[PDB]
Structure 1
Amino acid sequence: KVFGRCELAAAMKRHGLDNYRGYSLGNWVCAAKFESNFNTQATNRNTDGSTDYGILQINSRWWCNDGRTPGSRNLCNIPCSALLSSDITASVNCAKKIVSDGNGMNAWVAWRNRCKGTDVQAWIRGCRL
């Protein structure tokens, strides 16, 4: 599924992401825009044997198990295929774990390069919520 911006913002808000560990909702929507272009089926197969999965492009080395990646930690305790759902729950739950395991939003390269320092509120302006 390819989300709309406001539809994704509402879903993320329902799942508790606004102000999770001090990151406002627009940070999460921005990260998803630049990671996956809002596409829940996005996959990026890397040359290191890992793959980035889903709307938030969560990597298979540390976070989910795909059975093909060397050094797998599976810290979210899920198959990576759960991250390719039209429902965002598993991706949200694992993203909360990523920030709870000591990392901030810098874990997402696209957030650091394309969201940090910008008016992230623009991503939820006019919506819903």
Structure 2
Amino acid sequence: KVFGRCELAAAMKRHGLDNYRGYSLGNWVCAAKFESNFNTQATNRNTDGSTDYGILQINSRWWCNDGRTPGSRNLCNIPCSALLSSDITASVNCAKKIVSDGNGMNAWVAWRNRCKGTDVQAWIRGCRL
């Protein structure tokens, strides 16, 4: 599924991401925009044997198990295919873990390069939440 900006904002809101660990909802929508262009089926296969999965491009070395990645830790305790659903629940639950496992939003390269230092509230401006 390819989400709309406001649709995604509301879904993330329903799942508790606004002000999760101090990160306002627009940070999360911004991160999804530049990680996957809001595509729940996005995959990026890395040359290091890992793969980035789903709307938040969660990586298979640390966070989910795809059975093909060396040094896999599966800290979200989920198969990576759960992150490719049209329902964003598994991705949000894992994203919460990624912040809770001590790193902040700097875990998402697209967030740090394209959202940090910008007006992230624009990503939810005009939306019904």
- TM-score when normalising by structure 2: 1.00
Query: Between Structure 1 and Structure 2, how many residues are aligned?
Result: 129
Aligned match of 2:98: 98
For residue 33 of structure 2, give the secondary structure of its aligned residue in structure 1.
Answer: helix
Residue by residue over 1:30-67, the C-alpha shift from the partner in whole angstroms, topping out at 9 and shown as x without a partner, is: 00000000000000000000000000000000000000
Overall identity of the aligned pairs, in % = 100
Cα offset, 1:9, TM superposition: 0.1
Q: Distance in 1 between matches of 2:109 and 2:63?
A: 16
Cα offset, 1:69, TM superposition: 0.1
- TM-score when normalising by structure 1: 1.00
Cα offset, 1:125, TM superposition: 0.1
Cα offset, 1:102, TM superposition: 0.3
Cα offset, 1:107, TM superposition: 0.2
For residue 118 of structure 1, give the secondary structure of its aligned residue in structure 2.
Answer: coil
For residue 63 of structure 2, give the secondary structure of its aligned residue in structure 1.
Answer: coil
Cα offset, 1:103, TM superposition: 1.0
Q: Distance in 1 between matches of 2:15 and 2:57?
A: 18
Aligned match of 1:38: 38
Q: Distance in 2 between matches of 1:100 and 1:14?
A: 19
Cα offset, 1:26, TM superposition: 0.1
For residue 44 of structure 1, give the secondary structure of its aligned residue in structure 2.
Answer: strand
Report runs of 4+ in structure 1 exceeding 3 Å deviation.
none
Q: Distance in 1 between matches of 2:102 and 2:31?
A: 18
**Which 5+ residue runs of structure 2 have no aligned equivalent?**
none
Residue by residue over 1:71-123, the C-alpha shift from the partner in whole angstroms, topping out at 9 and shown as x without a partner, is: 00000000000000000000000000000000100000000000000000000
Q: Distance in 2 between matches of 1:100 and 1:117?
A: 22
Q: Distance in 2 between matches of 1:50 and 1:102?
A: 21
Cα offset, 1:18, TM superposition: 0.1
For residue 102 of structure 1, give the secondary structure of its aligned residue in structure 2.
Answer: coil
**Which 5+ residue runs of structure 1 have no aligned equivalent?**
none
